[PDB]
Amino acid sequence: IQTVVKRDGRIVGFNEQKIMAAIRKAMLHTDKDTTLIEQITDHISYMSVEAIQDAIEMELMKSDVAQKYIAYRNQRNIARKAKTRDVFMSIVNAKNNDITRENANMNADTPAGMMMKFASETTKPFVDDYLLSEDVRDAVMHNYIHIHDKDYYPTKSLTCVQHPLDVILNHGFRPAKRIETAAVLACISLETCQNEMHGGQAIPAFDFYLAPYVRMSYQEEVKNLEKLTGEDLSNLYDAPIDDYIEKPLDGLQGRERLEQHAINKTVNRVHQAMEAFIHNMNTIHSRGGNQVVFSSINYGTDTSAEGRCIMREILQSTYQGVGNGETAIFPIQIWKKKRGVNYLPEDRNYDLYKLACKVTARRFFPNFLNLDATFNQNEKWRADDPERYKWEIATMGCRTRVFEDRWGEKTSIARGNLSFSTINIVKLAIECMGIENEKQRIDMFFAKLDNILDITAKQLDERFQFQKTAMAKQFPLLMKYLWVGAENLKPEETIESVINHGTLGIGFIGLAECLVALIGKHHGESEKAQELGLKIITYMRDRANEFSEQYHHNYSILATPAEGLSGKFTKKDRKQFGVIPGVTDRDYYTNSNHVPVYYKCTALKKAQIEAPYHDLTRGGHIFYVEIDGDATHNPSVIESVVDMMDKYNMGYGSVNHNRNRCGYENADAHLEVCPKCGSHHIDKLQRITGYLVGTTDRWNSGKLAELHDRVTHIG
Amino acid sequence: IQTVVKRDGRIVGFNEQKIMAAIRKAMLHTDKGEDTTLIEQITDHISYKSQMSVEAIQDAIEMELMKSARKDVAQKYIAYRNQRNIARKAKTRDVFMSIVNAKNNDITRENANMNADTPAGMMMKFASETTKPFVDDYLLSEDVRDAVMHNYIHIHDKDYYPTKSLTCVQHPLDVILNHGFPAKRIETAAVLACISLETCQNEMHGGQAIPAFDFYLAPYVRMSYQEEVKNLEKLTGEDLSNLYDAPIDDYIEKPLDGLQGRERLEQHAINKTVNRVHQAMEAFIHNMNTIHVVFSSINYGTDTSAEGRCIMREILQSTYQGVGNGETAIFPIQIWKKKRGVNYLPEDRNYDLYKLACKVTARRFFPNFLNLDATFNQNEKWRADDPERYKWEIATMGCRTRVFEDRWGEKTSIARGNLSFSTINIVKLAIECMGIENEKQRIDMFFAKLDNILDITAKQLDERFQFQKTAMAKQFPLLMKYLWVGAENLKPEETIESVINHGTLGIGFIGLAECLVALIGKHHGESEKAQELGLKIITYMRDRANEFSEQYHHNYSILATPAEGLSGKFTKKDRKQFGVIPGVTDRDYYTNSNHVPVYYKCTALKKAQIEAPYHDLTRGGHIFYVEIDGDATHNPSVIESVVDMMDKYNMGYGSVNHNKLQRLVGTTDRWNSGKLAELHDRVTHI
Ligand SMILES: Nc1ncnc2c1ncn2[C@@H]1O[C@H](COP(=O)(O)OP(=O)(O)OP(=O)(O)O)[C@@H](O)[C@H]1O
Ligand SMILES: Nc1ncnc2c1ncn2[C@@H]1O[C@H](COP(=O)(O)OP(=O)(O)OP(=O)(O)O)[C@@H](O)[C@H]1O
Ligand SMILES: Nc1ncnc2c1ncn2[C@@H]1O[C@H](COP(=O)(O)OP(=O)(O)OP(=O)(O)O)[C@@H](O)[C@H]1O
Ligand SMILES: Nc1ncnc2c1ncn2[C@@H]1O[C@H](COP(=O)(O)OP(=O)(O)OP(=O)(O)O)[C@@H](O)[C@H]1O
Ligand SMILES: Nc1ccn([C@@H]2O[C@H](COP(=O)(O)OP(=O)(O)OP(=O)(O)O)[C@@H](O)[C@H]2O)c(=O)n1
Ligand SMILES: [Zn+2]
C-alpha cells in the first residue's frame, strides 16, 4: 500500500497529495476537472514510481494531458546528460581537443580509432565507481595518485613480456627451415600477443635465435649448386667459415668459384629477409585502435659468423632506410655493451660497434645499454658456454627494466610487468609552503609521503588480487608457450600459481620542482638540494622494500614516462592554488629525476648530477642528450656520450636532434622550401618519451610546449 | 542573484535555506553536532547575478567545509551523491557483469569470427553497448524510431552509424603495386596484397575482395624468370641474352636427366621459378588465415597466358594439400568464374584447371562457381582478343553481395561498393492479417502494409546517405586517395559528396517461405499458387525499388539478406507476442530468403526449378545451396553435374557442403543460439 522509491534508492512514504499536484500542473494550459483528478487519485490508490507513470497516462487519455505529461518527462530526462553529448559530438566531428590527443600514436579520425574513445570513456566511470575501494577513490579524486592504463581494468590485461622465440620456431603453432620462414614467424608471434596486453613486446636475443638458419640456407644453396652441375661437394657443408663476406667474381675457377657463389647467394637472401622484417613491423596497422605494434629488439653479444652476419645486415638495412630515404619509426633497437666483447679495440665485435654508432648518428637508433654496471652483473655467466643469453639484461619499450627476483632465478626472459601507478609530490610540497621552520616542513613532507605510499601499495595489491582470478584460456598464446611457468595448466584453470613471477612499479613525477619549489633553487644549480633529493629517493626505496617484505610481492621504483600526464596535474594545481613563479608557470612538469629542459648545461654536469639516481630507480631510467644539427654528421660525438656513460654507473642512453621532413629528411636547423618537392609542408620528427611520433600535429596539447623549450647541449 | 541552473533543466530561483538543511543532514551523523556558528559564515561567504550553478555551489561548499579542518563532514557529504548517482543507473550492470565474467550469453555471441574472451573483444563489446543507445536518439526520426521499435525494420551495422563508414569495395590492385604507398619479385607482391587488404579493412566495416588475381600477379613471374636466368648466366660465363622474350607454352618441371649444353640451363630456371611461385602462394595462404582475420575474397579463372595458369595451378595445389598438418583452411574466399568457350567446353584452353578445381572442391570445399553471361551478367564490351580485359566482367565479393549496374556511369564492378543495407520483415505483416476469411481482402491489406513499410525504409536509407555525405576526405586515408573511383583529386579537408553517388543501397527481405506456409495458404514446396504469389510479391518490390531510384536520384537494389545474426531475433519477439503457431513460429528461426526449408527433403532438380526464377529479380544478391553425403569427397562427378545443372537453368552463384567444422567457422561452440538448431535440422541432397 505504501511502497514508493523515487528513482534513486530512497525509501519514502506515500504522500498521495502530489500525484494530484503533478496532474494539475500538467493541465494548467491545454485548452481542456477536479472530479476527474479525484477519480484518478482514487483509482490509483487501490511499488515502483517510474512504472506506475504509464498507468497514469491511460487514465489521462480516457478523458490533451498525456501528450503534456510524457513530453515534459522526456525533455527533462535528456537535459540531465548534456555533458556526454558535447564530448561525443567532439569525437564525431574529429576536432583537435584535449580528449582526442591523449595518445599521439593513434589516429582518431579513422573509424577504428574513433571506436576506441567511446569504449575508454564508458569504461573509466565503471572502474572508478564499482571496483576501487573508498580510500583509494578519495585519494584519486583529489589529484594525488594516478593509475596508468585505467581503461583496461576489467579485462585483466598484463603490460609487457619478453618473448622466448626458441619454442615457437622449433615446434611452431610447421617447423621453419629457411631464413624467411623464421623472419615471418617472429612478426606473427609479435602481433598475436599485443592483443592480450596493453604495453609492448621485446625480443632479447635476435642473433642467438636467428643464427642457426643461415647454415641451413647455405646447405640448401650448396645442394642446389651440386644438382645443377654434377659434382660431389658433400665435404663442403660443415666448413668453418670465418666471415660471410661477399666478393666480386673477377677471375677464378674450379670449386672455389662455386663456394664463393654459394656465399654470395646466402648473403643476399639474409639481406632480403631482414629488409622484409623491417618493412613488416612499420606499416601493418594491426594492434587495436589503429596502431602499430610496440616492438623492441636486442642484439650485440654474439661472436659466431652467422650472428655477426645478421647484425651487419640489419644495421645496413636500418641505415639504408625505408622508402625514398626515410626513417623507420619502429622497431626500437638497443645495442648491448660489454668490455671484452664489444668495447675495447682488441675485442671480437668492435667493428660492428664503431658502426652502430654511425647508424645512430643518422636514424636515432640504436640506443645503448651498459651491462655489468655494478647492478646488471650476474654470477652464472660463462664466456665459453654458448655465450649464455639467459643470464643477461634486456630492456622493453619505454624505459622498463625487469631483472631481479626473490623466489626464483635471476633472469630477464619469459617475465614482465603487471601494473604500475604514479604518485604526485608537487602537491604535497605546495600544501606545506606556509611555514618558516625548515625541520618541521621536511618532517611534515615525510609524514605525508609515508601516508600516501601505503595507499598506493594497497591499490597495487588490490589490482593484483583482481588479476589473479583470470582464466587460462583468455590468454592462449601468452599462457601456453610464452611464460616462465606454462605448459602445465589446462585452459580451464586459473593462473594463480604462475603469476607471482612478476613486478609491480611505484613511480613519481616532478622531483625538479616538488622538493625545490619549497627551497630557493633546484638540483641543477644548488649543491645542497642533491642531498635532500637523494634522501627522498632513499626513503621511497626503503619503504618499497618494506612493502615487498610485507605483501609477499616484488615492488620496484620507476621513473614514469609522462605522455598524457605531462599536463594533467598542472592545470588543476594552477586552478586551485593559482600561479607560483618557477613552479606552475610552464604548463608542464619536468620528468622524473631529470634536470629542467630549459636550463642550459653541458653534458658533463648533467651526467654527474643524474648519475647517482640510477642505482636507486631499479625499475627504469634514461639519460637523454640533445645535439645540434651540424654535429650529427660525425659519429665521434655518440662515442663521447658512451664513454662518459661508462665512466660513471649508468644503464641507458640516447641522442636526439631536430629533423625536418617528397620525403627529403634534411637535418638542418631550419628549412624553407624542400629541394625536390615544391610543397610548403615541412614537419618535424622527434621523440616524446621513447618513440618517434609523426609530425607536429598529432601531439598532446600540453607536452608541445616542452618541445619548444628544449636546450641543445652541443655534444 | 536569485537564479541557479539545475541538473533537471529547471532554472527558477533558490530560497537559500536548503543549503543549511543539507549541511545539517551531513553533520547529523559524524558525532559532531556543530551549531549554526560555522554555517552562518559559510552561507554568507558562498552567497556573496545568476552566475552560479548547482555544480559550482557543490565545489564551493565542499572547499569551504574542507578549509574548516573537518573533512569527515565533506567525506559523507560527497559519499551521498555518489551512492545516489549509482542508483540512478546500473540498470545495465548485469550485461557488463556477464561480459566481465566471460559467460556464454547471447550478447557475447553475435559474430562467430570474433573472440569475446580477449581484451579486444571486450573493448569492442563495450563500444557497441555504449554506442547503440546513442543512435536511437538525436540521429534518427520519430517515425523511423517508432517503426524500428515495433520490430519491422532492422538497420545493419547500427553500431558504426556515427562513424560514417561504408561497407565494402573492390580493390584495383594495380596502382598500389606500380606506385607504392614498386614490387619487383613475386614475394613482394604477395606481401603487398595482404598489407593492402589489412590496411583497408580498418577504414570500412565489411569484407574485401580482389576482382582479378591472375591479371594482376601474372607480370611478375616473368621478372622472376628473368632474374633467375641472369643469375645462372652470372654463374657460368655465357651470353644467354636472347632467352628473355621467349614464349613459354607452360611452366612444367621435369627431372634433369639426359640433358646437356644449353638445354639444362632452361629447365633449371623453369624449376626455380615454379618453386618460387609455389612458396609465395603457400606463404600468402598461411599468412591470410593466422593474422589477428579480415574477411577476404579473391576472383580468378579467366586468363589464358602461361603465368596466370601457373599461379592458378600453384594456388589450387596449395589449397588441396592444406595449411598446417592437413587441416582445412577457413579463409580466404575463392570463387571460380565460368565463361562459355574459354573455360567450360572440352575444347577450351583451361579445361584441366576446371577439372582440378572440381577435384579440390570435394575435399576442401570452398572454390565456388560464378556463371557469367547468365542472361544478365553479359556485357557488350567484353572481347578476348587484345588484352582479354577484366574491367568488364562480373566479380563477386562474398556474403552474396553483387554490385554491377549503375545509371550515371560505366557498367563495371571495380572500385565500387555498397554503402548500407536494411532489412524488412514480411512475416509479422502476414501474422497480423491472419483473421480475414476473404482472400482478396487479405492480399490487398498485405500489399498496403508492404507499401507503407517500404516507403518508410526508403526514407530511412536516404536519411543515412545524407548523414554520410558530409564525411571528410581525411576520414579514410587510403580508401579515398587511391581506391574509390573518381576520388584521386580531392584535398584532405574536403567533402566526399562528388564521389559517393556511385555506390549502391540495398533493401533486403527475409522469411519468404514462412510468410505463406499458413498465413496465406500452403507451403512454398508442394504447391503451385505459392510460386505465383511469391513472384508477384518480388515483382512488386522490384517495381517499388525502381520508382524509388527514379525519385530520390540514387541506386536501390533488392537483396536476399545474409543471416548476420538475424536468425533468432525476430522469432523470439514473435513467439512472445503472438504465441505458438503450428508450423510458423515453432522452429525458433526463419528460413533464409527465397529458399526451401532445410527440413523439407527434396532433390537437386526440384530445388533448381523452384529457385531459378527468383534470381533474375534479386539483382543485388542471391545464392544457391547444395548438401551432399560424406562419399562426395571421393567423386568430383557430382560437382560437375551440379554445375551443369546450374548452367542449364538461369543462375548466378553456387556452392556445395558436406555435413566440428561446417558452413566458415571452427568448432560448434562460437555459434549463435538460433543457428545451432538449424544445423541440427539439416538434410542431405545426394
Ligand atoms: N513522494 C512521492 N510519493 C508518491 N508519489 C510520488 C512521490 N513523488 C513523486 N510521485 C509521483 O511519481 C511521479 C514521478 O515523477 P518524477 O519524475 O519526479 O520521479 P522521481 O523518481 O521522484 O524523480 P525526479 O523528481 O528526480 O524527476 C510524480 O509525477 C508523481 O506522480
Ligand atoms: N510544469 C509541468 N508541466 C508538465 N508536467 C509536469 C510539470 N511539472 C511536473 N510535471 C510532471 O511531474 C513529474 C515531475 O515532477 P517534479 O519534477 O515536479 O518532481 P517531484 O515529483 O515533485 O519530486 P520529488 O518527489 O523528488 O520531490 C513528471 O511526471 C512531469 O511530467
Ligand atoms: N533549489 C536549490 N537552489 C539552490 N541550491 C540548492 C537547491 N537545492 C539544493 N541546493 C544546494 O545545491 C546542491 C546542488 O546539488 P544537487 O545534486 O543536490 O542538486 P539538485 O539538482 O537539487 O539534485 P537532485 O535533482 O539530484 O535532487 C545541493 O546539494 C544543495 O547543496
Ligand atoms: N543523509 C544524507 N547525508 C549526507 N548528505 C546528504 C544526505 N541526504 C542528502 N544529502 C546531501 O544533500 C544534497 C541532496 O539533496 P536532495 O537531492 O535531497 O535535494 P535538495 O538539495 O533539498 O534540493 P531540491 O529542491 O532540488 O530537491 C546533496 O548534497 C547530498 O549530498
Ligand atoms: N602506443 C603505445 C604507447 C605507449 N605504450 C605504453 O603506454 C605507457 C604510456 O606512458 P604514460 O605516459 O606514463 O601513461 P599515459 O599518460 O596514460 O599514456 P597514454 O595516455 O598515451 O596512454 C608506457 O608505459 C608504454 O609502455 C604502449 O603500450 N602503446
Ligand atoms: Zn621534395
PDB file of C-alpha atoms and ligand atoms in Angstrom, chain A residues 662 674 676-677, ligand 6:
ATOM      1  CA  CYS A 662      58.742  14.063 -51.190  1.00  0.00           C
ATOM      2  CA  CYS A 674      62.224  21.368 -49.927  1.00  0.00           C
ATOM      3  CA  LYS A 676      62.689  18.392 -54.648  1.00  0.00           C
ATOM      4  CA  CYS A 677      59.056  18.744 -53.550  1.00  0.00           C
TER       5      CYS A 677
HETATM    6 ZN    ZN C   6      60.742  17.157 -52.006  1.00  0.00          ZN
END
